[PDB]
Amino acid sequence: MSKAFDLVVIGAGSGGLEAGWNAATLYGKRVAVVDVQTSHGPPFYAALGGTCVNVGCVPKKLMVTGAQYMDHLRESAGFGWEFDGSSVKANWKKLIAAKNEAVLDINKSYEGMFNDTEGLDFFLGWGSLESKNVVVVRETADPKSAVKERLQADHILLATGSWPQMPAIPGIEHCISSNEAFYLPEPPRRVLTVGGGFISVEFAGIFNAYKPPGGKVTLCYRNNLILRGFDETIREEVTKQLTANGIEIMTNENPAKVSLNTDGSKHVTFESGKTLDVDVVMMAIGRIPRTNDLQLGNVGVKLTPKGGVQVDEFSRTNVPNIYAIGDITDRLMLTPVAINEGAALVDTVFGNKPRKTDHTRVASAVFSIPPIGTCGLIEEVAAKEFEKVAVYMSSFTPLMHNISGSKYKKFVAKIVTNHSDGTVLGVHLLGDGAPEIIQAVGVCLRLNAKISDFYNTIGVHPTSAEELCSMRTPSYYYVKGEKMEKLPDSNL
Amino acid sequence: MSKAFDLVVIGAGSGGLEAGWNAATLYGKRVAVVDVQTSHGPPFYAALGGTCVNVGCVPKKLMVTGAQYMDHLRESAGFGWEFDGSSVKANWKKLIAAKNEAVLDINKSYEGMFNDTEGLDFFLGWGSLESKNVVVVRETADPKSAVKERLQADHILLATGSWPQMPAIPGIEHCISSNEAFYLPEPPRRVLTVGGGFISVEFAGIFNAYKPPGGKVTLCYRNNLILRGFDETIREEVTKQLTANGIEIMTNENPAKVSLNTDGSKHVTFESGKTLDVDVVMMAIGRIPRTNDLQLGNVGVKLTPKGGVQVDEFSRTNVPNIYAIGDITDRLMLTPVAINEGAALVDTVFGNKPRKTDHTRVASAVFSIPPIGTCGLIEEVAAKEFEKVAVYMSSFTPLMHNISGSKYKKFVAKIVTNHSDGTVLGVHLLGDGAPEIIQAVGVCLRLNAKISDFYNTIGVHPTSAEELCSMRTPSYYYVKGEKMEKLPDSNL
Amino acid sequence: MSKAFDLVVIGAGSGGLEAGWNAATLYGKRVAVVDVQTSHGPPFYAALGGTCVNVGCVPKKLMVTGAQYMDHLRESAGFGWEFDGSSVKANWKKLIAAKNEAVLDINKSYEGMFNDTEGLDFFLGWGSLESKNVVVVRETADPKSAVKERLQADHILLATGSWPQMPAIPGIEHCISSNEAFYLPEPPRRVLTVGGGFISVEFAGIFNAYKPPGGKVTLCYRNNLILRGFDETIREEVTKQLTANGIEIMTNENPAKVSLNTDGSKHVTFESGKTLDVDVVMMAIGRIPRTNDLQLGNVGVKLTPKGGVQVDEFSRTNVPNIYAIGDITDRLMLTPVAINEGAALVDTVFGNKPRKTDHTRVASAVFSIPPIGTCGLIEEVAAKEFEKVAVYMSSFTPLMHNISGSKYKKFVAKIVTNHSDGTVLGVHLLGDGAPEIIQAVGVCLRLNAKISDFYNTIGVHPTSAEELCSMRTPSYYYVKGEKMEKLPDSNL
Amino acid sequence: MSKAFDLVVIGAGSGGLEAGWNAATLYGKRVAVVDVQTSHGPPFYAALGGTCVNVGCVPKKLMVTGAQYMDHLRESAGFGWEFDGSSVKANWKKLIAAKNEAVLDINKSYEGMFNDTEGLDFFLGWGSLESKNVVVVRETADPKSAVKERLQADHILLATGSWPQMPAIPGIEHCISSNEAFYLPEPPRRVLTVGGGFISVEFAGIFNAYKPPGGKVTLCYRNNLILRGFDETIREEVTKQLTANGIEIMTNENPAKVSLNTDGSKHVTFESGKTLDVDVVMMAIGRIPRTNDLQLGNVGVKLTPKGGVQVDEFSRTNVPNIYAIGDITDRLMLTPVAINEGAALVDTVFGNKPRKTDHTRVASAVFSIPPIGTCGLIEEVAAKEFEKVAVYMSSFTPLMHNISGSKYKKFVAKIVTNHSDGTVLGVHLLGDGAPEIIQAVGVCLRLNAKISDFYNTIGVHPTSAEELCSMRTPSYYYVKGEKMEKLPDSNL
Numbered sequence A, B, C, D: 001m002s003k004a005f006d007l008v009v010i011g012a013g014s015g016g017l018e019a020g021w022n023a024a025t026l027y028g029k030r031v032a033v034v035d036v037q038t039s040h041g042p043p044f045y046a047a048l049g050g051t052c053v054n055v056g057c058v059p060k061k062l063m064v065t066g067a068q069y070m071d072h073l074r075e076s077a078g079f080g081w082e083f084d085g086s087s088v089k090a091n092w093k094k095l096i097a098a099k100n101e102a103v104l105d106i107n108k109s110y111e112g113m114f115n116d117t118e119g120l121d122f123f124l125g126w127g128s129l130e131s132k133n134v135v136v137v138r139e140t141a142d143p144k145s146a147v148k149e150r151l152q153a154d155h156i157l158l159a160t161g162s163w164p165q166m167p168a169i170p171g172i173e174h175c176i177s178s179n180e181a182f183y184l185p186e187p188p189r190r191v192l193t194v195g196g197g198f199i200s201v202e203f204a205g206i207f208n209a210y211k212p213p214g215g216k217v218t219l220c221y222r223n224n225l226i227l228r229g230f231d232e233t234i235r236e237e238v239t240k241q242l243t244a245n246g247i248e249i250m251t252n253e254n255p256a257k258v259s260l261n262t263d264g265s266k267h268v269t270f271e272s273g274k275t276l277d278v279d280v281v282m283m284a285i286g287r288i289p290r291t292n293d294l295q296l297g298n299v300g301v302k303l304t305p306k307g308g309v310q311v312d313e314f315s316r317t318n319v320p321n322i323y324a325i326g327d328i329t330d331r332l333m334l335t336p337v338a339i340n341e342g343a344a345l346v347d348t349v350f351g352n353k354p355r356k357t358d359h360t361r362v363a364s365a366v367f368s369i370p371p372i373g374t375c376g377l378i379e380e381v382a383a384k385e386f387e388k389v390a391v392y393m394s395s396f397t398p399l400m401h402n403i404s405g406s407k408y409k410k411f412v413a414k415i416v417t418n419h420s421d422g423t424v425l426g427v428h429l430l431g432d433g434a435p436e437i438i439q440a441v442g443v444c445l446r447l448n449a450k451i452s453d454f455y456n457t458i459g460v461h462p463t464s465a466e467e468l469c470s471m472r473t474p475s476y477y478y479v480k481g482e483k484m485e486k487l488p489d490s491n492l
């Protein structure tokens, strides 16, 4: 009578929701959506709305913003502003509440989105894969828990997202991930964030601003330079500026074991013998695709070398009617990229207008203090797949920071082109504005903009973004992998 | 031998310097630049560096930045920041002193650029035309004053910029302009900025931030809406947000006379009849090309019916070998335009490649609070030029401001389109980050981007700039010049 | 919330219903019941109530009763009754309607039994076995049909009953089983029933009485003597009396192929070359257990050599929580035996008072004309497992049939005892009353009654049943398998 | 030498013959049997074979059978049998002639049994006692008639049965008894059977079947309920079903006188005063032991205060070597009792094993329409004998009669129990098959079966007898003689 579902979706995250909406309202298809909670917070943290809405994008931005105010208050003095210095109090409990209320606002809107949209229904519980055309809902992630629904399905979309990767050292239970940090009752006086990823950096600034008096935020990384994957010079600069803002950046170090002290504080011993005491140890060493609770072996879905789900240029798997998008693919773990993959999966199946999502020249940010904006390739990657590479550099200390009292906040801007046709292959910004600036840059790369298009454009003065139009000559080259300043006069 | 150059520049301003520097460093020419001061301030205000550096873009940006801190301190309470609210106060003298140091530093650097660059020489004095090939440098703007130098010139470049226009009302002696506002001894308690332009608006925000307790900024404009020539919706939102911060906006009002009070304050009387008592009256009704002291009549350089120096698309005047750029041409009065006008003038005259400054689709800004970023045409003009016009629109109060408490700060992002092909004709933003976002939006219009190129781009989550890649259907249309919520019938 | 079912039952037959009732009302267990129809008749014939209620016990008795009236009318003449002989009409269409209304009466009562008994719910559809704890309901018997329910189950009872066995000869589609005979639009003029089982015999009498004028009921059997399994002398007698009543009993014959004539009648060719034309060919060559539509391979349920389901003395299978009762076990295909097995399965599981059903010394009947009553062993089976066997025989022509005009209706009565202790091992009756007589006899065997208990009881005169008390001396013996009249005087 | 035997039997009836046959064939004794006729009918009615064969069990059974055909022809319409209803009629002469042939055949066989069995001799005449060891056979029942034989006897067995009791009312000359009813020339149109016993009831059904058009059977009984000594509920159901067939039942009525009408019919006048005109008046108020013509006073054989011959449990009279059995002892007046009484008498006297007839728990019947089968005690008596008494009951209209149209024919099946152990004390059935069902029920009571032994037995589907194995809980109880719907309190 009620049949199956033209589509069932496991995980109502960024990608999950964009696929079920574009199907119930765009194609009148029957759609079901299974997620393990309706509201943010423990025990599962991620809930209806995805990691982005509950324990990612939205709440992180709000908290970084609040953390920027530490710098604002300090810098206002250069501009003549005075107020009781010792009376300032960073109320963490007040910040988390404001955040929680914002997140729950989104939790409810989606909560109502389902209650007035026929063909779109929400099922609370854990979704495991039974047959190649049946999804199993259970009260818990345990494959042997009570069943509450069995959703007959024509198409099945896997959008369970990703999960924080934890190492195998003794005492790892005394550690937290990005998940639990959003819900600390009090701001930790001493915090150690492990790893060099954008998550460890972004939370280091947040903890650094809301820490009570006498606090030290220590960030450790097992290799030499943090923020592996981002442009080189931006890496070393951000390291310098994090140090300036009081954060101890402790490189070439890896925790080896953690214990509890007589007062509940964590005692951390490293692989190099050095010990450090902290109130909170946060693991941000990577995110793995979330596939264990899915029982993907019951149908024989294939996984890549990394624990991720394998797919093609259309998000299809080996099983004929099973698709996967979002962070479960182990590709570009970004929210707009999962919304693009999800919107693209639908109108290629339920709309016979096949259009796949492009995974290259994608804009991303890193709301650190200072923030980062990137798009396209970095110079050392362009080298390994391009004849002649040109690099445009420029690192002025911004206009206002001679007065502000923050001389260290050097703004950086790099452009990477194929020197053959001057086409821009990358754009890498460090400094306030980088995130908002790069967005419009992503449209340029989608338009195959050559460097001439940039410096021939009239600037908006006075801005930092105008520095992208002020670079007319390369600072060095990358020809057949080698890096030399002057470009040797020896053609062909 | 001596005193025989390739180029003489009257005015070490934006356009002038760029012209001379390029001429001397890029083409090894003997260049001479004349200006009335080497450092900012009275009695001549403008100086080495131009109006922008000494009494324009640079200084106001710093002062706006300082006025933004009134909002920051207040908005921080929403993010858990506590401190004695009653202890906040702005020191107007510390703002000015800090601004003087910054501007002075640029003055110091530009000098020494002359000392270290051969073929580039500076001459302190007042420049004027004596013949078709001779610039005279006198000790004052008066023709009767002593001659300092006579410079032989194969080419003369007029680059003296513009000057504040002051209406000839009785009591005008008791008023100031933008020039002197940069140097007030104390912040005015009651102030009246006159004019609906960007100068009056921007300054209204600065005075509103630093006014002592019980102050009141008052802006008046003789017409019904401020910021003529900007997108209307933005014009009206900036009016609302200004009123939301404390600024009173007196429209359809124009001062008729000013008189002194016993205490020494001012007594303004408008045309309509009303009266206001204020401590300062700042005039910002416009700026006129600075042709006054150049003796253009000795050579016959023809002026425009609007009052600027008449020039073709290559900056050539009616007199051979004499050129004009910048505010003196009375076109687009923006620094990057003059700079680009100068760099192009040099390439054309001393190179083997003609270059002319494209004057359309120039991205400019307005540093109100919040700021404005724009680029291209606005609705009205597009409807006069194209067959079918589409308007993509998006307006909301960002989440970060529902928490800060500044709920009036509604973001705005219009997009004007030619619906006959989709090419973007203009972009108009309002809110935090608008000036930075718009910069790369100028590269896209130079590339003739289409509305699809924007929504087909993957966005950066979460940012204000996303809103540009998210408007897919027109909010309304403009067919044959008439506005309508939807199109005609079927077509195709 | 609603969990699983303390018990789900596939097939709502004689056994199915007795198990779900004794559980919902006796033990407050949650119970589900899956059957493929609510009302009798095509296309599935058997429906809610089982084979017994729809196409077995109840409707067969009603039709045999109606068929007995052919003999009644004939025999009344001996007692002085007269009426128009040629005006008698056996209206088959009127009989089937009266039957259908009786069956549907039962169909509805059960239909209401479910609607006012919490914990007892009826599910329409086909039940297939998914996991070892899930039953699959489908719109049809096709394993690839749409699903309407998936019943989570704690215990699973298999009670699908049995199905008519059809041979593999060309033209078998032109044949019918016991199922379709209950719904013939008209009574067949010429009918051939295949097989020697009680079903072929019972329907031969029914067709024989309601056949239109000029009809011949031919019963064929592939071996020598019909009614294999019943006592020997009763077999040969019933053959004789069926012949007397006009039925052609054609032994040592088996159909080899069947075709259609120009008029729709079936043309039957035998393995011996002889041909016969009939309007209806009814196959009653055996009943097989009904397991194909159950997908028993999905869980690995074990089957006996015969296609039946294997079980122990408690109706349990290899799969821990899967039980089977009724005709699906391939044991004693009787309705009271499935009601006993079903009532016994429950209060051994949901009542921890384990009591199994006894499969020996069970009373059964054969409502032929004349009818048969049996209970216990037959003489030739007692031989193969008993030292000394005694047989008591007695074959009087009943009181009333010297007048009736039916001298052939010889009533028979055999008793079989273990000659050691005289315990009665069997009792075999032929003649009207046999079914009602034997029932009370079954209680005697449950009481280990010796033969002395029988002939020492005072008879009810005049009856046929009194002949069981009138046999005081054996007619022959079976000692160590051999059959001799006198019992050789040579003991030990 | 001659006329000197081992046993002389007065009365070749049921008990007599069984006695002599066993004596002569089982023990090789010289036996002589005396009776007044060799064939049934007037003037003596009873004859060789006893009352049962000639004017009792045998003939009525045939006549009841013939009366059952009135119901069969009518009930057959429900099963699709059609025929001219108005053409049915019963030929009372053909019934009698056919019954005469059947009875005569038994008469013929019993004779020739004498002709072929040595030591067994028959003597036609009237037997009476002349001395303790001499039986005289005279030509008529009168002592003054001629002596035919004088038989010397070591043992004399009185077995002359009983005789109809006729009340001494005026007009009794115009009435008949059961004897003459077996020989009426024509069926009475109006008839009045007198008595509430089984004879009056059974005959009422026969006359009701064969009455000519516009007839009316009328049964009267001087008390309030017919069939005293039978189970009450059955008594009242048989009354209802009799009234349902056409018989009028006049209770609390007793005829006071009969007189002749002009036409030759009868004019009955009851005690209460009412009057009825009928064609025949049949008396069946009881039967008295036939001691009239035996000359018991010549020897001193003592009679019972109730009028029968006094005998101990071994059939011995006060006079040595003289024995009595059957109706003449005035105990249970049933054929199998006398037979069993005879067979036991012979075993005791001419064997080496004493045997006495158990007179309790004897299963008898009553061939009304529908019939009655019973065995053991009824409610009332059990309550006088046992502590706690349980009554299992079941009453319904079988399905076959909801179709036949005879909806009054409600089956009944009581079961009386001693609730102190469960042993079955009695069984009472009403409806088709009751006489046959009850026979084996007599074997069970001899085995002291318990109520559990019945419901724990597997039934025969579908039959009336099932109802016995289906009553599990008492319908009501009888504690200390008082009736109550449930027991006392708790106990155990």
Ligand SMILES: Cc1cc2nc3c(=O)[nH]c(=O)nc-3n(C[C@H](O)[C@H](O)[C@H](O)COP(=O)(O)OP(=O)(O)OC[C@H]3O[C@@H](n4cnc5c(N)ncnc54)[C@H](O)[C@@H]3O)c2cc1C
Binding pocket: A010, A011, A012, A013, A014, A015, A016, A034, A035, A036, A037, A044, A046, A047, A048, A049, A050, A051, A052, A053, A055, A056, A057, A060, A125, A126, A127, A128, A159, A160, A161, A162, A178, A199, A290, A293, A294, A325, A326, A327, A328, A332, A333, A334, A335, A336, A338, B460, B461, B462
């Ligand atoms: C701290 C942090 C900051 C980030 N910041 C940014 C940022 O600034 N910009 C950006 O673009 N991206 C950011 N990301 C990444 C972004 O949140 C993810 O890439 C995005 O959520 C991917 O979408 P998705 O639907 O595939 O995953 P998700 O949105 O996480 O979807 C997973 C959902 O499925 C549910 N689920 C999982 N398993 C099951 C199951 N078995 N049954 C039922 N439901 C299940 C989960 O509870 C969850 O609700 C950030 C991530 C983190 C952790």
